[PDB]
Design an enzyme around this catalytic site. Structure first.
Site, short mmCIF file in Angstrom:
data_model
loop_
_atom_site.label_atom_id
_atom_site.label_comp_id
_atom_site.label_asym_id
_atom_site.label_seq_id
_atom_site.Cartn_x
_atom_site.Cartn_y
_atom_site.Cartn_z
N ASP A 110 3.19 -2.71 -16.18
CA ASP A 110 4.06 -3.34 -17.15
C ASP A 110 4.54 -2.22 -18.08
OD1 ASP A 110 5.38 -5.17 -18.84
OD2 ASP A 110 3.75 -6.65 -18.65
N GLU A 149 7.22 -12.30 -26.25
CA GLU A 149 5.92 -11.65 -26.28
C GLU A 149 5.17 -11.85 -27.61
OE1 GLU A 149 5.82 -7.85 -24.01
OE2 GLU A 149 7.98 -8.20 -23.73
O1 LIG Z 1 10.90 -5.22 -19.91
C1 LIG Z 1 10.18 -5.43 -18.70
C2 LIG Z 1 8.78 -5.98 -18.96
O2 LIG Z 1 8.51 -5.85 -20.37
C3 LIG Z 1 7.15 -6.19 -20.71
O3 LIG Z 1 7.00 -6.04 -22.08
C4 LIG Z 1 6.84 -7.65 -20.31
O4 LIG Z 1 5.46 -7.92 -20.53
C5 LIG Z 1 7.19 -7.90 -18.83
O5 LIG Z 1 7.07 -9.29 -18.53
C6 LIG Z 1 8.62 -7.44 -18.53
O6 LIG Z 1 8.87 -7.57 -17.14
#
Ligand SMILES: OC[C@H]1O[C@@H](O)[C@H](O)[C@@H](O)[C@@H]1O
Ligand SMILES: *[C@@H]1O[C@H](CO)[C@@H](O[C@@H]2O[C@H](CO)[C@@H](O[C@@H]3O[C@H](CO[C@H]4O[C@H](CO)[C@@H](O)[C@H](O)[C@@H]4O[C@@H]4O[C@H](CO)[C@@H](O)[C@H](O)[C@H]4NC(C)=O)[C@@H](O)[C@H](O)[C@@H]3O)[C@H](O)[C@H]2NC(C)=O)[C@H](O[C@@H]2O[C@@H](C)[C@@H](O)[C@@H](O)[C@@H]2O)[C@H]1NC(C)=O
Ligand SMILES: *[C@@H]1O[C@H](CO)[C@@H](O[C@@H]2O[C@H](CO)[C@@H](O[C@@H]3O[C@H](CO)[C@@H](O)[C@H](O)[C@@H]3O)[C@H](O)[C@H]2NC(C)=O)[C@H](O)[C@H]1NC(C)=O
Length: 602
Positions: free
Chosen positions: A285, A491
């Site tokens: 991630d 998030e």
């Molecule tokens: O930006 C791409 C990724 O960012 C991360 O902060 C998230 O947890 C992921 O779900 C996402 O795919």
């Protein structure tokens, strides 16, 4: 002489083996590196043999950029990669979690929580097909979806990205994968990667594993549960993703009983690869490995060693690629990481690229540009928006006349609320911007617009964001539709311990409903304190995060279709009951999971 890997008529495994065998260490570590377009250059990609690029939330060419602009940006980076000694195409990833959401003009479908309320897997599969088409319309070939987390605590800022708190439902919703990648052959071996062709995209089951089970729903935190529960609740859907050939799997920031997923060799290699026999590639991630340590990045060297040995194949750096490549190179040169670990990683990455036809179709198809925002996709979204709505109340007393459906013909009606005419609020997180936004950020129809487009010509429609009680009592209204709710969030920004909507919200509803019969539309990414709202309203609908097609909301409010949605989560009485999911010992819900009042089309 003949170059096997460049021969599109040969088996994938043969092509992978042939290519891997010609690669230098720099070219192998290169395939394992995914960088943000913001730090990408023709030279950087070319000189570092970059194997992948990506746009994080909000990372775009220009605000309002067209589909061709995106295609031109991607092709630009691709040409750089195609000029390397081996000419290995790069794979571009992006978060198309509810449509090609970063792109202006893209169809914005309802977020996952609302999609679970539909209990319609075929619908979700169809959304995955439209999403793939619209992602390819911008030249991108990889979508970081679907998120198959099983949210067990509403306080989690990402709970709206979870189809449900019930694994059985999340399992069923994995139909998005065949939609995005296309159906797998009847022979197909579970665990193998799959993508039909240039009109489909590689998918990604995330976030492995238990990301939806952290304590108090704190994002990226610790998931405390015995192995029985981890496998009974959070693991199931992944097995389905394997059966449906999901091409990639993203590792979660979260931890399981104190162990960082990005460093858990037992789960990533021992289980996901060896047990479920996943043959696609495992990606990290955003700065996932950085956060293994605390402070994050306090020991990047360890980060790389732990994550790579744990089994991860591709790393989403996504900026400091020099540091990443340098450190990993050192470790291999020093024997800390075996070439077999690298070859395995590069094997999986290449298998995915060959299988999806990247070597045959490295560039964008200009004819696909018009897929972006195609009216049929919007119609689909409209259907999904409507099907996702959950009617929680439709009358103050058992003897009251049902407020919904509302008549399209009325002398004068009121539409109010902070969410009645705010497209950004209607879409929620992951829309244009990372954290989502407020206002007319893209092409769509708000609730107000939808109302104006539905009522009879003789029906006067008045809009007032926050009318006081007086304005309503003397407005001469037949009824009112008030929309209120949460603000866009993504998030950690979404983590919330009180789960009560921002004001003015309750006050507007109390002002409006006090003056005329009202139908409250609640926009949120999860259940929120709702007793007060219920108390003031004649009818109340949980619209979750509908997306860009607001008419889906009015399609139910006015009777063109009857409400059919059922709660995918448990609706609590108060936040201190949480956690609290179906099948729990102290199950004392305001609304059981599966709850939903219905209506019949007029
Ligand atoms: O930006 C791409 C990724 O960012 C991360 O902060 C998230 O947890 C992921 O779900 C996402 O795919
Ligand atoms: C229950 O807990 C949550 C914590 O998760 C809490 O919400 C958070 O409260 C923070 C303050 O402690 C706040 O941080 C500040 O945000 C300021 C800017 O905030 C606006 O812009 C952001 C960015 O999009 C939005 O997310 C916010 O919602 C807010 O938006 C504006 O809100 C007003 C009032 O509702 C509205 O009229 C505007 O139209 C709207 N405009 C926009 C942009 O849409 C920063 O400047 C400051 O530096 C802080 O960082 C968090 O943003 C917020 N989290 C979110 C995502 O909402 C919540 O607090 C309640 O709600 C907030 C919005 C505020 O009204 C508080 O007074 C209120 O108490 C809390 N609830 C309870 C019961 O306490
Ligand atoms: C789950 O979330 C909690 C936070 O709610 C994490 O605990 C917190 O950890 C941070 C650091 O990791 C602590 O912050 C402080 O930072 C300063 C800055 O240098 C430092 O000097 C202090 O000594 C302290 O570390 C914070 O105190 C701590 N809070 C709590 C509630 O204990 C926890 O680590 C997270 N767990 C996982 C697996 O992510």
């Amino acid at each position: 002489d003949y170059v096997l890997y460049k021969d599109a008529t040969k088996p994938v495994e043969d092509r992978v083996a042939d290519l891997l065998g010609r690669m230098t260490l720099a070219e192998k570590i290169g395939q394992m590196t995914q960088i943000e377009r913001l730090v990408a250059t023709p030279d950087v990609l070319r000189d570092n043999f970059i194997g992948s690029l990506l746009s994080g939330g909000g990372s775009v060419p220009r605000k309002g950029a067209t589909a061709k602009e995106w295609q031109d940006m991607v092709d630009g980076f691709q040409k750089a990669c195609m000029s390397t000694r081996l000419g290995i195409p790069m794979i571009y990833g992006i978060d198309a979690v509810h449509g090609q959401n970063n792109v202006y003009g893209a169809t914005i479908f309802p977020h996952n929580v609302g999609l679970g309320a539909t209990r319609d897997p075929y619908l979700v599969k169809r959304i995955g097909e439209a999403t793939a088409l619209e992602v390819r319309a911008t030249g991108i070939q990889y979508a970081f979806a679907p998120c198959i987390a099983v949210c067990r605590d509403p306080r989690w800022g990402r709970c709206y990205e979870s189809y449900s708190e019930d694994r059985r439902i999340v399992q069923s919703m994995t139909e998005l994968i065949p939609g995005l990648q296309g159906d797998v052959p009847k022979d197909f071996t579970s665990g193998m990667p799959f993508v039909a062709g240039k009109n489909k995209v590689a998918a990604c089951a995330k976030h492995f594993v238990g990301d939806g089970g952290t304590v108090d729903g704190i994002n990226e935190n610790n998931t405390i549960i015995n192995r029985e529960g981890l496998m009974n609740i959070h693991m199931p859907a992944y097995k389905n993703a394997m059966d449906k050939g999901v091409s990639t799997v993203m590792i979660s920031y979260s931890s399981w009983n104190g162990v960082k997923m990005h460093a858990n060799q037992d789960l990533v290699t021992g289980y996901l690869k060896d047990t479920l026999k996943f043959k696609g590639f495992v990606i990290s991630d955003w700065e996932g490995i950085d956060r293994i340590t605390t402070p994050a990045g306090s020991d990047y060297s360890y980060s790389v060693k732990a994550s790579i040995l744990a089994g991860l194949d591709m790393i989403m750096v996504p900026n400091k690629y020099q540091q990443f490549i340098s450190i990993l190179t050192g470790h291999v040169n020093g024997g800390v990481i075996p070439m077999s670990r690298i070859d395995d990683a590069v094997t999986r990455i290449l298998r995915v690229k060959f299988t999806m036809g990247l070597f045959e179709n490295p560039y964008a198809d200009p004819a696909m540009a018009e897929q972006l925002g195609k009216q049929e996709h919007r119609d689909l979204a409209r259907e999904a928006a409507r099907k996702s709505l959950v009617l929680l109340k439709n009358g103050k007393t058992s003897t009251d006349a049902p407020l919904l459906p509302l008549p399209k013909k009325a002398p004068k009606i009121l539409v109010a609320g902070s969410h009645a005419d705010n497209l950004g609020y209607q879409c929620g997180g992951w829309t244009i911007e990372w954290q989502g936004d407020t206002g007319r950020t893209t092409v769509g129809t708000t609730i107000l617009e939808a109302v104006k487009a539905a009522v009879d010509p003789s029906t006067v429609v008045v809009f007032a964001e926050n009318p006081d009680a007086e304005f309503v009592k003397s407005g001469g209204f037949s009824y009112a539709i008030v929309a209120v709710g949460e603000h866009p969030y993504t998030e950690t920004k979404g983590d919330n311990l009180n789960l009560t909507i921002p004001e003015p919200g309750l006050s507007t509803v109390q002002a409006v409903c006090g003056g005329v019969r009202c139908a409250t539309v609640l926009i949120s990414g999860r259940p929120v304190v709702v007793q007060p709202l219920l108390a003031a309203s004649d009818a109340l609908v949980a619209a979750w995060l509908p997306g860009s097609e607001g008419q889906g909301v009015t399609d139910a409010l006015f009777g063109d279709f009857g409400f059919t949605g059922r709660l995918p989560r448990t609706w609590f009485k108060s936040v201190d009951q949480l956690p609290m999911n179906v099948g729990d010992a102290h199950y004392d819900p305001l609304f059981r999971l599966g709850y939903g009042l219905t209506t019949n089309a007029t």
